[PDB]
Design a protein around this nucleic acid. Sequence first.
RNA 1: GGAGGUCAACAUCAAGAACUGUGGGCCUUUGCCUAUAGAACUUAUAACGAACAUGGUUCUUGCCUUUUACCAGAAC
Lengths: 107, 68, 48, 83, 136, 49, 48, 337
Amino acid sequence: LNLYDVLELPTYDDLPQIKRKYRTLALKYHPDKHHKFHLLSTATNILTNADVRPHYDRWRKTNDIERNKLIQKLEESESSTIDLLQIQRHGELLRKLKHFNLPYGDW
Amino acid sequence: HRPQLEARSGAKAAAYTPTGIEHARLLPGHTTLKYRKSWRKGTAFGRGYINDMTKSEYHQEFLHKHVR
Amino acid sequence: SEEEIKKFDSRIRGILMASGSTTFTKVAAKWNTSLISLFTYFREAIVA
Amino acid sequence: LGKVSSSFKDVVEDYCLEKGYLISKIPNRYTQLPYGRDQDCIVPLFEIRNGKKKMEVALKHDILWVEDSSGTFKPIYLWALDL
Amino acid sequence: EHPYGKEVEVLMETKNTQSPQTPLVEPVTERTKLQEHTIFTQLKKNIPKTRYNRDYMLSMANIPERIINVGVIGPLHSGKTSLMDLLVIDSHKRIPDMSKNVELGWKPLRYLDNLKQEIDRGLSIKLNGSTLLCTD
Amino acid sequence: GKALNNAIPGGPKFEPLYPREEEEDYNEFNSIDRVIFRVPIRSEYKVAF
Amino acid sequence: AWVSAAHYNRERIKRGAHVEKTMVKKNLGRLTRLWIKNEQERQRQIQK
Amino acid sequence: IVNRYEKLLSQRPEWHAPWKLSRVINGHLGWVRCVAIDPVDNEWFITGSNDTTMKVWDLATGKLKTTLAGHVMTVRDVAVSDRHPYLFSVSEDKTVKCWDLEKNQIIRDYYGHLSGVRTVSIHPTLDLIATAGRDSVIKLWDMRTRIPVITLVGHKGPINQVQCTPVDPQVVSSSTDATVRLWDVVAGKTMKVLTHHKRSVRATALHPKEFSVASACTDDIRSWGLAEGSLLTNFESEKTGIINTLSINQDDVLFAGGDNGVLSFYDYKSGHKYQSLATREMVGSLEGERSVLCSTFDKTGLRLITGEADKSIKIWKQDETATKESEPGLAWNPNLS
RNA sequence: GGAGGUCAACAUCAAGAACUGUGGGCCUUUGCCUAUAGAACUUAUAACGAACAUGGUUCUUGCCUUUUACCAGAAC
Ligand SMILES: Nc1nc2c(ncn2[C@@H]2O[C@H](COP(=O)(O)OP(=O)(O)OP(=O)(O)O)[C@@H](O)[C@H]2O)c(=O)[nH]1
Ligand SMILES: [Mg+2]
Ligand SMILES: [Mg+2]
């Protein structure tokens, strides 16, 4: 579950925006009015400092990875899709001599 | 007194009262969905896709035959 | 030959589709003529 | 050519005799054969030894086929065989 | 061709690949059904319960003098397979394949039969054994 | 009997179930020169085996 | 579409399976139209 | 109002790469009216036709897998299902036929349109179908029991194009009365009307992400935010008319098929037109027959598939060289409206 | 309390040759492994029926002016 998923909220927010997010959620899901908030407190802890918020978000992306896999599969699929006579003849000649019985040359 | 100039709006049929006749084709069928997871010499002689229906080759084969 | 077999069959179908109400007698002559013509030209062959 | 009484295999045998190599039938084993057509023939194969070397030959039409190192038979000239 | 001429593949398709019957979306079969080719029990929990305690049997295997190999042969319909049936259903306590019918059987429970073709054909074809301990 | 479009001399007659026999493939395989005509291979055998 | 219906109905009649009394007549009409078009095409192309 | 015009000169939008022609597939006898793509594996097309058939083409090599007949007249629309192994086709014969992809045979027929039915869209989560056509009403079909559960009275003319969305408005519709309605189905009445188009709205497309829709008309392709129902943006278009279809790549590229044969690609964010192509008609075709009847992108969005009125399907691929050397398209000059 | 009833309601009856409950271990409820108890009815020349009807859609035919009514095979 994502921190965004836990709060039931949507996904570069500022340190200010981080504070405002908590404030908005607090109004909605105020624990004193209505375990989930544990997540909110932690993520807010880093989000309230813009640095932590940014780094945390730094590390949908995976799904993009799914797109990459699809692309690889497509590339593999499309690109891929996109003397004897003399020998038998010589053998035929060789048998003819054997039939005629004429001595074989040292082949 | 001829042709369509319009079509009939289904809206009209939406306001009528139902009759409730039972048809043959609405009887239950497929009732369960599926979810996914030297002689020769003496003679006188001898020694591609167009897009259209009428001018194609198959057509001239056709009419070349069936008309005899 | 297969062709003229099909021509015969097609002719009988002719009498059928056409003689919706042409009377029995008219049909019979038409049926006979095709038959006499078919046998006589091939007389011998038809047996096989 | 149909007229000619003699059969190849015979020729091969004759050739082998001069070499002193011995050709043996090998009953079960067979190799899929690629010939001009986009189809592969199946033929039984035999192995010829000069002393104690075994190599395997399958002849279809009028030709001798010897397998390439990775695998799959390649046609070769009769003079072109030395074991 | 020349209208495009270089990179473009102009392909004119008629006929078909993939003969019409093919599913075009493959039905997902989660379990593997053997029932077509043979009839055979694939779980650890459905193997019958061998009153004589299999574990104790496997111990006999250490003593080479103790275990013996008996084959059963005889002409058509002499009753071989239906004899093995007697041995088995004596040994095992509860067999899932017994119908109420064959239990009091009118119809012979043929246990070592096991193959579809041998069931319908009425005969026995490929040899099949069993291992069990039994008291003299 | 039905699937193979045969009849037991007292059995019922059905439709073909596979209406097209007409396609014939020509290859050296079944050629007369290579076959021995012994026993007729009459119809009752087809239903048995 | 019209032409393709003419071909299809014709090759349905060659097998001779349940063609209506009129469809034979109509189909004949479409075929004679098409045949004359082929003729005039051939003649013009001979002029040019 | 100039302030807006300055605020159009700050942005300098969204570079993309041009497109070019990878593959041409002949093989339909009539026109190609509609195209849809296997939403899971990207292994194939189903293409309607004007010859009544439907021909399932392989996306990889372009070979023809199978043919599905079964309609007596032209097939205006085809839609394949995600959750189900079903294919819903619909035609001018007044009928919406289901197709079981497993056995390739018609399963169900839905009945009850007065006349030709030009659009099917498969609701994502509900096991519904939405069909529409010259009836001038939208019929919400229960997929299982074939009961036309809900009917949406509304537009004063034929209904060209219909879409489905998981949240509110669950059905978006577009008609020849030059409107686009955003429907609320449970109550069964219009949630919002969007009148800004001047003539028949002949095509729409849903952005795969942003939750908006792109609507078309003769000369003006607009966009629309769903939810509120605001206008979002406009797209720069001089006369391209007539716009037969729209399609939205996952990269925010907005395709526009012309009746003049021009392929007008846009950026979706901006409204800028970064490329315009012209198709080659065909060997023996007419200059009238050059147009684009339908189109779509694969699940990836790096290929484009356009059925054309010249009886051919064309597959447009995105150039890999590109970048800034020479991509640049028409380069963002916002003329005065 | 026992026997019944041309009484009713509610369950269940076509499948990895296949059921359910419970004890323990691993992953993290699901699921896998291990231990234990009980399994009515229906199934092997396969099935609730030792019997045997009809209808719909889609193909192939057959009658053959066209529709109902149909001919006889298949799949769902
Ligand atoms: N009267 C009688 N008939 C029996 C007896 N045992 C078996 N049969 C019948 O004889 C037939 C043969 O019995 P099976 O044991 O199944 O046949 P089999 O021994 O396997 O014969 P194979 O398949 O050749 O091994 C069966 O159909 C039984 O019904 C018996 O003890 N008495
Ligand atoms: Mg036996
Ligand atoms: Mg009438």
